[PDB]
Amino acid sequence: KEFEVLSFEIDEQALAFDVDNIEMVIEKSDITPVPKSRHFVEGVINLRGRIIPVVNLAKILGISFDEQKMKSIIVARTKDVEVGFLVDRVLGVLRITENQLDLTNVSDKFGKKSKGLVKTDGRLIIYLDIDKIIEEITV
Amino acid sequence: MISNSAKDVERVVESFQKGAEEITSFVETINAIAEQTNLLALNAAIEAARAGEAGRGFAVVADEIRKLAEESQQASENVRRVVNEIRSIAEDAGKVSSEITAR
Amino acid sequence: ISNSAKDVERVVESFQKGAEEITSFVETINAIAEQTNLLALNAAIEAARAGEAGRGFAVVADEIRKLAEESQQASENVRRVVNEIRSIAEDAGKVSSEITAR
Amino acid sequence: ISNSAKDVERVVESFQKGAEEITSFVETINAIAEQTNLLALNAAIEAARAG
Amino acid sequence: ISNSAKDVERVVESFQKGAEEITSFVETINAIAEQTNLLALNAAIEAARAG
Lengths: 139, 103, 102, 51, 51
Known about the structure:
The structure is cut from a larger assembly and holds one copy of chain A (139 residues), one copy of chain B (103 residues) and three copies of chain C.
Chain A lengths: L2 E8 L2 E6 L3 E6 L13 E7 L2 E6 L2 H4 L10 E5 L7 E4 L2 E7 L4 E2 L11 E5 L6 E4 L1 H8 L2
Parallel strand pairs in A: 2-11, 5-7
Antiparallel strand pairs in A: 1-2, 1-8, 3-6, 4-5, 6-7, 9-10, 10-11
Chain B lengths: L1 H49 L5 H36 L2 H9 L1
Helix pairs in contact in B: 1-2, 1-3
Chain C lengths: L1 H20 L1 H25 L3 H51 L1
Helix pairs in contact in C: 1-3, 2-3
């Protein structure tokens, strides 16, 4: 299968999840505070007439990050919920080949909510599982 | 006559220190426009790719618009380095224009 | 004042060459912006042919077209200042050497 | 006539600006016509395919 | 040397005139090439969308 994913970075590390679960992408501006909210969330924004929660991806994966550097909110779309992810730069749509996709889950510490790792001669594009990431926020 | 000629140095020096900030505010504007056009083109490209078969012909054009937008973003980051060089050569000249005017 | 004038010759040549060097970016940005306008128009003139299916693609194309025609205006204001700066660069030729001669 | 000849320097300067204002309209008319040409070509490359 | 320098004044003017004639060919070549570019883009922007 030829998978189409959205490529984007955090802290000099490439990441990506499918285009199937994308609403659009925007640049950060003031995020409305919600009182007594979970620590891995920034707040809420109004996007296309809907109230989208703005999650901080790196606090879900447990990876190192620098908060000021981030400025791109990637709005996702699942059947359960629609959620924005604050990150660094974005590339766009990257067609990946099944031949170059490794499925090992013990390679790095966030490998269980990662669907795999795309091998390449540039920065290694890690394939996430949107599903298991939304499954984390609702517990 | 070296008086009148050095006063005409201050005409060139303050006209170039004004022309630095002039072009700088116009380049900050062509930067803003380019990176916003890049983001608008990228949104089109992603939403079109998501749309599948009928989205494809639009995604091709959208990515070609994005290519010219990121060539305009590159062009804006080069015309800025030279306007910031022109700035330095204009401001760093005013310490010499005030020395020839004093002497 | 003659050795303080040699600092001015160094500046005036960096301005004379710097005004030919910035002019290639006036030409280049104008060209790209006028191409981006025609390309955005080429998308606009056919996203409207897709009706309800083209809806949000004709809205984005519009704001791309409108932004790219503002890139032309900003470029026309850089052209205006670069021409003024280029003519001052050549004018400064006189003031520069009329000191070290006197 | 020393003052009447200074009026001519002012006229010749108003000519130099007056030909630069018509050159911005040459650019404007030319630009509009090249867009109109491209629009007519986008129609021609498909009306000639439309039997 | 006075009559041979008048032959140089003829040359220096023929350089100035020959460089205004060669500049009109720079204008022409740019024009044809920039249209050739735009025509090739008009074919590319739809031949890639013609499967």
